[model samples]
Target: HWGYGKHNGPEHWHKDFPIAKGERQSPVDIDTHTAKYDPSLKPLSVSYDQATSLRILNNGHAFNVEFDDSQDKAVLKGGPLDGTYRLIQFHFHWGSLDGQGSEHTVDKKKYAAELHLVHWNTKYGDFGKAVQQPDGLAVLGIFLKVGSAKPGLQKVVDVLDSIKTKGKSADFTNFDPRGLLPESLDYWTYPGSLTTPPLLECVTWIVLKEPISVSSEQVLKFRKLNFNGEGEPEELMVDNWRPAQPLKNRQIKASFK
Candidate 1:
């Protein structure tokens, strides 16, 4: 299986997932000074229904909270987007040590972790079909800083015990993801691909400027997860994040000056 290990890590991914070497790869370093401030950028409109949350599963790579996106129960609009984008699932990427896991860096500074709220543009139908288009996805990147305990994230951390092993899953619902976001919604926008396999360059990235707080204890729990499933040699799931890609000629637009 493809994993973040010495044998088959991100460097070797290009052999199997050719798109990994594409022009608009994700997780780039955001040079704040070079980012252009656009006054025309609209405020983001986000609506997430707590009940739309379905379950949380450990896919070996990361634990994700899946949602019911059939009816747009949760969606993100505005903020450099042309149409509504339905929330499908949200996952995270982190490192084993402090101040080191985030995929996207800011001025060469890495955060404790990074959160990805995956969504697909509804105008092109479902995620499957939409993923193939140029304007298919809209992923929200929220950085996580080590700090006091976050009440909202507690719900997710509580279920970690059940899904400690790879491929393990449990029921997780009635949690409002909005509670995990920071107060300020000011962000930077850019075009990039998925950080994982089949790295399609269809995402319109909206990375928030403010980071959400996560206690050190909570961050440790994430590292406890196993990358290999039951019966396989245990492998700790740390440093699942991909390294920052080169920013060829893409322009990063900021919502605020």
Candidate 2:
């Protein structure tokens, strides 16, 4: 009853999920006017060979890829943050289950979708253990939209044929998830929490305001997943997005240095 066609949709998620009231909830609107420029931050670095341990999991809502700690892979620096952080998981949020989908809004304007590349402090061991620390986590958010055409996203959509069924997932071989990133890395950084359950307030979010394009058909494939319970018949929950949250008293900063 909680899958697609359900009356409440994600709007009623708060009833069953007590964490919905979290102050750090994500999918917040990103306003450039509210952002400040910070120079003390460092730049991000990536070592491809070390990022090989990347693995994907079909967690119902989206295909989330996890980076193994044993790999001394990519490292992120600067942008209001200092030190190296390791990759963890990459996933997404979208609108209407169609072309336009995203988790964040820019200056009160909503986009097509949003992608998240998660990481944690390697200084604190693996992502699992580091998640408990206040400054141990970092997440890069990229916005998405439907337009002319983009080849980068093909790597992601191409693999969907394997995980088309509910609870079905395949090991995405020879695929470097980093290829899905947008051209520009310049981003807006802030202190936030996990958008999902537990809603831990230990994350440093780097949201890229620029959007990348994906085909409208690819967006359809994304919405073809079953997000309901076991007994359900793979109900489609394609446009799985959380509405923008209130900004409370926090200040979002951008790094152009």
Candidate 3:
């Protein structure tokens, strides 16, 4: 029921979910000049050789590409994490236009879109148990710049048509997750919460410095999707992103100098 529409949008979320105003809300402005360069922070380590990508689904809010996390098949470690955190799913936060889309911004600069690779700590065993703990989740966020045509990104764009409405899903496999990442792994790490509703303050935000390119045509394909189900009122799933929350007293550290 919490749509990003004019009525039940982000401003109204705090009314129902009080935690929406929690201490560590996500998608904060990454002030590069202010962030401390931590020499102790380790480079992020990602392993997807064993990745078992399952399918794609339009989960009401946004289109989600699920991953088989039964085992540590695809895991992200290092860079502010204690151990291997398994990738459960990944999704995108975009805008109606190219001028404003990405959830997390750098020096108040917005991107065309943003990519979230959600993971849960192995110590908690599953996403369910891990999400409640403070050190439960680790989200690797990559900004998507609208520029050149990259076939790697087209892999997902081609499959989006099947899941054009809320609750719709389709089998999507073989496409490697690494194909979406930029060349550099340098990142800015901070303690933050889920950008969406039920905003749990349990995520370790790892916003990458580099962004992969996707053509405007490819990104526009997602706008055709319906945020509402087929039976419900028709509304395109555009601007499915939350605005930046207060940084509070949270400290942001950078892996690169």
Candidate 4:
């Protein structure tokens, strides 16, 4: 029932999910000047087995490409993390227009979209236990800019035609998620909650400073998705991102100067 509509969107989520107003909420407005430079922050380590990519789904909200987190096949480490975290899944947030879609903004600046690459610490045993702890999850946020076509993203965008409606999924094996990232690993680190419902305050956010480009045409392809399942009134999936939450006691640390 929770969706990006006015009735059940971000604002209404607080009614069912009280943690929506928690202190360490996510998708904060990142003011570069306020972010402290932490040279001690290690370079992030991201290793993936393309074969781990399983399927892509519309999911009635943001379409996501699911992955096989069975073992340490695809993992993320270093960069403000204490231990190795297994890659679970990755998804996106976007809007109807190119001006505003991203959850985390830079100095009030919004992007066409944002990508979240999720992973869970192995020390917690599995994702279930990991989601309950502060250090449970690590999410990589990559801003998506609207410009020239990016082949890496184009590959996934091309598949959007297959999953045009909610609950629709298709085989998406051997796809590399690394192709979705920017060239630089330099990022802003902070402790925050998941932007979606349950609003768990257990995510360690690593937002990349660089943005990857996606053609305007490709972005429209994403609009082909319907937030409602088949037979229901077709609601085009757009602006499926949560607004920036307040930055309370948290201080964002930058890996680069």
Who is ahead in TM-score, 2 or 4? 4
* Candidate 1 off by > 4 Å: none
lDDT of 3 at 174: 72
Clashes of 3: 0
Q: Give one digit per residue, the lDDT tens place, for model 3 in 113-189.
A: 99999999999988999989999999999999889976778878988888888889999887689888899999999
**Tens digits of per-residue lDDT for model 2, 152-240:** 67777777666665566667655676677777777887777777655567788988756788878877777765565456676665666
Instruction: Tell me each candidate's RMSD, in Å, in order.
Output: 0.9, 2.8, 0.8, 1.0
Query: How much lDDT does each candidate structure score?
Result: 0.92, 0.70, 0.91, 0.91
lDDT score for candidate 3 against the true structure: 0.91
| TM-score, cand. 2 vs. native | 0.86
Q: lDDT tens digits, residues 83-127, model 1?
A: 999999999999999879999999999998999999999998899
Give the candidate number with the greatest lDDT.
1
TM-score for each candidate, following the candidate numbering: 0.98, 0.86, 0.98, 0.98
When summed lDDT is taken over every stretch of 10 residues in candidate 4, the lowest stretch is 45-54
